[PDB]
Structure formats: C-alpha cells, structure tokens
Amino acid sequence: GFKQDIATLRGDLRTYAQDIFLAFLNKYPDEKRNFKNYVGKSDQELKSMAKFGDHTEKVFNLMMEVADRATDCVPLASDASTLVQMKQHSGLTTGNFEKLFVALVEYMRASGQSFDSQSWDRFGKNLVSALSSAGMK
Ligand code: HEM
Numbered sequence: 001g002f003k004q005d006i007a008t009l010r011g012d013l014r015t016y017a018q019d020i021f022l023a024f025l026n027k028y029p030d031e032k033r034n035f036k037n038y039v040g041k042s043d044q045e046l047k048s049m050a051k052f053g054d055h056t057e058k059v060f061n062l063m064m065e066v067a068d069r070a071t072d073c074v075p076l077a078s079d080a081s082t083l084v085q086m087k088q089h090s091g092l093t094t095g096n097f098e099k100l101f102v103a104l105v106e107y108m109r110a111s112g113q114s115f116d117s118q119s120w121d122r123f124g125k126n127l128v129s130a131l132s133s134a135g136m137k
C-alpha cells in the first residue's frame with residue numbers, strides 16, 4: 001500500500017525522483033517555464049547535470065516526508081503550509097502540483113510494480129486541496 005510505496009521509493013529515491021520528474025516535464029512541456037535551466041535538454045542530458053539529480057531528489061525526499069506524515073493520504077496542514085511558504089514556490093499555483101501528481105500516478109500505473117496508485121492519486125488531490133487551504137492560488 002501507501003506506506004510500502006514510500007519505502008520502495010525511498011530505497012532508490014534518486015532514480016524514481018528523476019524518472020517521475022522527467023515524466024512530468026515531458027507530459028507538460030509548458031511546465032518547464034518554472035525551470036529555465038532545464039530547457040532544451042534531453043532526459044539523458046538533464047541526468048548529467050548535478051543540480052538536476054540533487055534538486056529532484058531533494059524534492060522527492062520532502063515529498064516522502066509529507067507522504068509519511070500524512071494520515072490516510074491526507075497531508076498535515078503544516079506540511080502544506082511549508083510548501084506554500086517556500087520562497088522557491090513563490091510563483092506557483094495548485095495546478096503545478098496537480099499536474100506533478102497526475103504524472104506521478106501515471107508513472108506508477110505504467111510501472112511493472114504494484115504501487116498503490118489509487119492512494120497516490122488521493123494523496124495528490126488531498127495535497128492540492130491542502131495547498132489551497134494553506135493559501136496557495
Ligand atoms: C510535493 C511536491 C513538491 C515538493 C515536496 C517540493 C519540494 C521542493 C524542495 C525541497 C525544493 C528545494 C530543493 C533544493 O534545495 O535543491 C524545491 C525547489 C523548487 N521547486 Fe518544489 N516541490 C514540490 C513541487 C513543485 C512543483 C510542482 C513545482 C513546479 C511545477 C516546483 C518548483 C520548484 C522550483 C522552481 C524550486 C527552486 C528552483 C529549482 O530548484 O528548480 N516544486 N521544491
């Protein structure tokens with residue numbers, strides 16, 4: 001289920017982080033607007049950049065923190081607030097996060113593995129609604 005998926009992901013976090021983030025950027029080309037240093041580079045090129053692996057993993061580490069602190073795939077309000085208030089997230093709307101988890105859910109379903117896709121789908125929707133309650137546009 002959800003808890004095991006957190007362990008699966010954390011076990012090889014950098015690899016999953018990159019795979020899922022690439023699936024997201026490729027599914028929603030316009031989203032690269034929030035990542036000017038990633039434009040005009042193939043998946044394999046992005047992989048070779050230090051800050052791509054570093055940032056993507058640090059994103060997914062935080063995401064696993066929030067996921068693990070969640071109850072029934074409902075994240076803590078304080079975790080959503082953290083995400084809203086991050087200076088790096090100044091420009092963002094819940095739409096950015098919604099698309100990320102759409103991509104994440106899609107990745108899981110297409111994976112050979114028994115991820116609990118429905119739980120992650122719920123977690124994503126519940127994060128979005130919590131982001132809104134903590135003040136994100
Ligand atoms: C649950 C979802 C997310 C989590 C947990 C998360 C977490 C983080 C973390 C930890 C950092 C700092 C990374 C570092 O120190 O290198 C970061 C930076 C950043 N994030 Fe998020 N993030 C999420 C979603 C998003 C989304 C959906 C977008 C835009 C589509 C976004 C855009 C950015 C930008 C622009 C930065 C700083 C510039 C950069 O590192 O690319 N984040 N995020």
Ligand SMILES: O=[N+]([O-])c1ccc(O)c(O)c1
Nearest residue numbers: 021051052055056057059
């Ligand atoms: O949301 N993500 O997955 C992100 C956000 C910023 C990054 O620099 C990154 O490599 C991934």
